[PDB]
Amino acid sequence: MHYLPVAIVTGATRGIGKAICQKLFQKGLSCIILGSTKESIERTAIQSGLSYQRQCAIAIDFKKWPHWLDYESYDGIEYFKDRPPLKQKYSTLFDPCNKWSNNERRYYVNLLINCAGLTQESLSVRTTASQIQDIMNVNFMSPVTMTNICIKYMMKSQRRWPELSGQSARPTIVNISSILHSGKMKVPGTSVYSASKAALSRFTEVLAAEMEPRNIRCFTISPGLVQNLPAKEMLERTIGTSAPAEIAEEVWSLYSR
Amino acid sequence: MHYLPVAIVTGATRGIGKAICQKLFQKGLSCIILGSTKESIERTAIQSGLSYQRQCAIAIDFKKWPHWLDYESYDGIEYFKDRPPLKQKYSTLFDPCNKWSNNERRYYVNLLINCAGLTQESLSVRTTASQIQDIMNVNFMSPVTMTNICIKYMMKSQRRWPELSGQSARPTIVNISSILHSGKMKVPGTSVYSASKAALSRFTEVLAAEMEPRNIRCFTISPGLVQNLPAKEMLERTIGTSAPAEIAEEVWSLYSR
Ligand SMILES: NC(=O)C1=CN([C@@H]2O[C@H](COP(=O)(O)OP(=O)(O)OC[C@H]3O[C@@H](n4cnc5c(N)ncnc54)[C@H](OP(=O)(O)O)[C@@H]3O)[C@@H](O)[C@H]2O)C=CC1
Numbered sequence: 455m456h457y458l459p460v461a462i463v464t465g466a467t468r469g470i471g472k473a474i475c476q477k478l479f480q481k482g483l484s485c486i487i488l489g490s491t492k493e494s495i496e497r498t499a500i501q502s503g504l505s506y507q508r509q510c511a512i513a514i515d516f517k518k519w520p521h522w523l524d525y526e527s528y529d530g531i532e533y534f535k536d537r538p539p540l541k542q543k544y545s546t547l548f549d550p551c552n553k554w555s556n557n558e559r560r561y562y563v564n565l566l567i568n569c570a571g572l573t574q575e576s577l578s579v580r581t582t583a584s585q586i587q588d589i590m591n592v593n594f595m596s597p598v599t600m601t602n603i604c605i606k607y608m609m610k611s612q613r614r615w616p617e618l619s620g621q622s623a624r625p626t627i628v629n630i631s632s633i634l635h636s637g638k639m640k641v642p643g644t645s646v647y648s649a650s651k652a653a654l655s656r657f658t659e660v661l662a663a664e665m666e667p668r669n670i671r672c673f674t675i676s677p678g679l680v681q682n683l684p685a686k687e688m689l690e691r692t693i694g695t696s697a698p699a700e701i702a703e704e705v706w707s708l709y710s711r
Numbered sequence: 712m713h714y715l716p717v718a719i720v721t722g723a724t725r726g727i728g729k730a731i732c733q734k735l736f737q738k739g740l741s742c743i744i745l746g747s748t749k750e751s752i753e754r755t756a757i758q759s760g761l762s763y764q765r766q767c768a769i770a771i772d773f774k775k776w777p778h779w780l781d782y783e784s785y786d787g788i789e790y791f792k793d794r795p796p797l798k799q800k801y802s803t804l805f806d807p808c809n810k811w812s813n814n815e816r817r818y819y820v821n822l823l824i825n826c827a828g829l830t831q832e833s834l835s836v837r838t839t840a841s842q843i844q845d846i847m848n849v850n851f852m853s854p855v856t857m858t859n860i861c862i863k864y865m866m867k868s869q870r871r872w873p874e875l876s877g878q879s880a881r882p883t884i885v886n887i888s889s890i891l892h893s894g895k896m897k898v899p900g901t902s903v904y905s906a907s908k909a910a911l912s913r914f915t916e917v918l919a920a921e922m923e924p925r926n927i928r929c930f931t932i933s934p935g936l937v938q939n940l941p942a943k944e945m946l947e948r949t950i951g952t953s954a955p956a957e958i959a960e961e962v963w964s965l966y967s968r
């Protein structure tokens with residue numbers, strides 16, 4: 455049997471998540487990309503790799519947490535180099551792996567990147583309750599559920615295909631935190647954004663302590679540049695930067711090395 | 712006019728929040744205490760101070776975030792030294808102040824303690840979605856809304872009673888964070904608990920940067936002892952402590968000095 459690693463990358467329709475995905479594909483993994491709508495994943499779907507490499511996109515709105523855990527199917531699209539996009543309906547996040555696998559080949563998820571992110575540009579007292587709900591559902595609650603759904607999958611896959619150990623990278627989770635999550639960079643306009651980033655970082659550090667003995671690696675990356683503007687320009691000017699290409703490379707570093 | 716400071720203390724029906732409240736009353740403030748149910752606030756309602764000092768309790772279930780923002784009234788009880796508890800219905804959190812104020816006296820909130828807390832004792836992968844929702848709604852979302860409702864109140868009160876400056880403590884918010892929110896203490900079983908504490912801490916640090924120039928002081932306190940048990944006993948034994956009496960004192964220190 456040939457086991458072929460797949461990565462799930464949330465927030466991959468554009469920005470940092472798009473860089474990360476390009477790297478991973480360049481480096482030999484198949485990709486399952488997440489976007490928020492049918493429209494945004496149709497947009498990404500319009501890159502030459504090994505013949506067995508595959509790419510698809512799934513539409514999940516992270517604001518709709520926790521209801522999206524219970525959707526029977528998800529709208530998805532498989533896309534290609536030199537062949538038009540294919541409408542799909544996937545029963546789970548791992549359904550694309552099932553459909554790619556054949557008598558000779560087993561596709562399986564071995565890497566999850568939580569990169570989907572919603573921003574904030576308003577003072578705490580001027581930020582509504584639903585805005586705070588959206589930010590936490592996209593930046594924290596959903597990433598937690600993604601992480602947990604994947605860890606269940608990763609552990610069960612490890613028990614059922616024991617040969618994977620020593621012939622694979624260890625199942626890896628990488629959550630994208632922000633420089634704003636701690637220290638000097640306390641930027642007005644971003645109180646709940648930063649907190650959600652603080653939550654994701656801290657969740658991952660504690661998860662890593664739970665997971666490391668079970669041989670799932672859990673990392674966080676903490677980047678910070680391209681907002682503004684979110685009072686705030688005074689600190690953002692007073693005080694470094696990050697490239698999406700640089701972050702994609704660090705993600706690969708963490709997985710491969 | 713005599714302006715008389717009132718404190719709102721969430722999570723004050725027992726534990727640390729009860730210590731904090733006793734201190735504040737000992738030190739001359741009137742108290743509005745929060746509990747989660749009609750029953751728990753009835754329980755607290757069954758302490759000799761100045762004649763003008765007052766105490767009441769209000770029932771708000773922090774799991775019901777964000778719906779509790781919209782309740783028309785809240786069940787409350789006013790209690791006394793040597794006089795039986797009085798059933799109340801309060802239109803807002805500041806309604807008790809309105810009812811205590813008289814031609815000679817003005818009661819107003821000048822201190823908010825977010826001390827209400829829900830714990831976690833399960834591994835991430837073994838913690839359901841609703842459990843994670845409860846923890847974040849009680850430990851983070853609700854405290855954020857409390858903080859914002861109070862800051863609106865505090866700013867408007869400052870504009871309408873300008874004499875308060877120089878004759879008062881500055882309007883103060885104290886959020887109770889936990890040693891678990893950062894650093895060495897990464898305890899299995901507590902991933903979302905710790906994250907919510909991380910979120911509250913970080914939110915408050917950024918809020919303080921927003922608020923300090925508007926003359927609202929925003930502090931966090933980070934205590935850590937009495938859980939267990941939440942794998943976990945190995946770290947909790949390997950590595951200090953905090954007394955509720957010690958924390959009550961630190962809260963008073965922060966407000967008075
Ligand atoms: N910009 C910066 O300087 C820094 C950013 N970061 C973080 O890195 C991450 C990458 O984003 P960034 O590179 O900045 O570029 P973008 O913010 O432009 O990318 C945002 C991504 O989030 C997805 N998303 C937004 N809303 C939802 C939703 N409701 N449900 C599901 N997915 C959603 C988007 O999908 P869709 O296309 O469908 O909208 C999109 O893929 C973020 O988490 C961000 O906070 C960290 C440090 C610095």
Ligand SMILES: NC(=O)C1=CN([C@@H]2O[C@H](COP(=O)(O)OP(=O)(O)OC[C@H]3O[C@@H](n4cnc5c(N)ncnc54)[C@H](OP(=O)(O)O)[C@@H]3O)[C@@H](O)[C@H]2O)C=CC1
Nearest residue numbers: 722723724726727747751772773774827828889934935936
């Ligand atoms: N225990 C420890 O060692 C440490 C605790 N802390 C933190 O300090 C805080 C104080 O709690 P603690 O002293 O430990 O004692 P308790 O946990 O026994 O007190 C819990 C309080 O939270 C309130 N609460 C629980 N659920 C809800 C809800 N759904 N809605 C509104 N209120 C609710 C309770 O009200 P009710 O009576 O109605 O249930 C109660 O007043 C917590 O935030 C905690 O995380 C920090 C460091 C260490």
